[PDB]
């Protein structure tokens, strides 16, 4: 029909409401701040609860992304990477992640977050400098979305600019393409 470029600009410019990114950042910052507050600063597995957060969010966001875009079910890692990089983030967060670090035989790749609106302004405490991720919700949302698109992936964070690394990378390695179900009529 049309290129994913044209689709992303068309959907973003004239088919979605808008708000200030500062306020979204503020809300997510409040969530993470209070999770730190009410949990004795157990950064080892506040990330797990944030992962559950992100999974529950993404599993029900996918119904809206497909509602607007109306793409077919992705089958191969190349098309999944292209769609995630090019329109899936462009609709919601208005960013274009870059893709590098292709693994062997096209089973894994990495999302590079050039600009992260979830962390427009944060300076973590000293104890968090090598424990917390602060953006686990994003990869949780990605996994939850791909679950309903019916392809399982282990997704995790390799690096983050917040902790001190040069760039923020999210490995999204596929595990298996689980198949559609059939009635169990004997």
């Amino acid at each position: 029909s049309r290129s994913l470029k044209a689709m992303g600009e068309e959907i973003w410019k004239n088919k979605t409401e808008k708000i200030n990114t500062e306020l979204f950042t503020l809300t997510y910052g409040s969530i993470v701040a209070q999770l730190c507050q009410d949990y004795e600063r157990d950064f080892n597995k506040v990330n797990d609860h944030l992962y559950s957060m992100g999974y529950n969010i993404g599993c029900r966001l996918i119904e809206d992304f497909l509602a607007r875009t109306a793409l077919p079910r992705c089958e191969n890692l190349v098309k999944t990477s292209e769609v995630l990089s090019k329109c899936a983030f462009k609709i919601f967060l208005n960013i274009t992640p870059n893709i590098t670090n292709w693994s062997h035989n096209k089973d894994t790749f990495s999302l590079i977050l050039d600009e992260n609106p979830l962390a427009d302004f944060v300076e973590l405490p000293m104890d968090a400098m090598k424990s917390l991720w602060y953006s686990n919700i994003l990869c949780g949302v990605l996994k939850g979305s791909l679950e309903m698109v019916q392809l399982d992936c282990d997704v995790w964070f390799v690096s983050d600019i917040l902790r001190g690394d040069s760039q923020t990378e999210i490995k999204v390695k596929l595990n298996r393409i689980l198949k559609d179900e059939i009635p169990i009529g004997e």
Binding site: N20, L23, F24, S30, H49, N56, L61
Partner: protein
């Protein structure tokens, strides 16, 4: 200036009651992420659990979500004071000007619409009336079980109360003299019938 999609914001802003209820479970569905088996639980399950848990845990989660909203409002305050630049003072005894600011700018920035008309005691309290209340405009259970709907949808009324409390904080009055309560007692006077039947009222007390 940069923007983010209202749909993802509205959904995220809706979904803290499951967060505020499941954090309590962790304090007091198995699957593997990479190597260690984490547990995840749905959102509607936790909404029902909050609906029928017991009184003290319900109150704990209510104060929990009030703290969340307090942080959000207090923290967005300074941004709004910078950007809009109203004509307020630090501790203005004229509560009408503060309430006009909250009605005009804070809600215009959080939700998409200005809040509706407001009462004026001129001595004590104030009332803020909202019609159709954007975040929960698409909530329901059943054709008949409308009585359970309003009691189950209660905790979602706290984050704007927390917003109001926080905005009043860092603008003079602290969180020991001010108290606010939300309710459905507002009735649709003449507006067109939207999905949700009842508008909401925030009763704000300030001595």
């Amino acid at each position: 200036l940069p923007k983010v999609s209202q749909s993802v914001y509205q959904m995220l802003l809706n979904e803290m009651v499951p967060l505020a209820m499941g954090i309590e479970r962790q304090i007091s569905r198995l699957k593997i992420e990479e190597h260690h088996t984490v547990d995840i639980i749905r959102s509607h399950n936790l909404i029902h659990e909050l609906y029928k848990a017991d009184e003290e845990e319900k109150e704990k989660v209510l104060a929990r979500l009030r703290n969340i909203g307090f942080q959000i409002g207090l923290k967005l305050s300074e941004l709004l004071i910078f950007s809009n630049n109203p004509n307020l003072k630090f501790k203005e005894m004229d509560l009408l000007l503060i309430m006009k600011f909250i009605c005009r700018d804070v809600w215009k920035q959080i939700f998409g619409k200005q809040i509706d008309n407001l009462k004026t005691n001129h001595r004590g309290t104030f009332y803020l009336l909202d019609y159709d209340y954007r975040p929960i405009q698409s909530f329901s259970l059943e054709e008949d079980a409308k009585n359970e709907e309003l009691k189950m949808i209660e905790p979602f009324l706290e984050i704007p109360v927390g917003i109001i409390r926080g905005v009043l904080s860092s603008l003079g009055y602290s969180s020991e003299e001010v108290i606010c309560l939300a309710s459905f007692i507002d009735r649709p006077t003449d507006r067109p019938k939207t999905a949700f039947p009842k508008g909401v009222s925030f009763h704000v007390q300030v001595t």
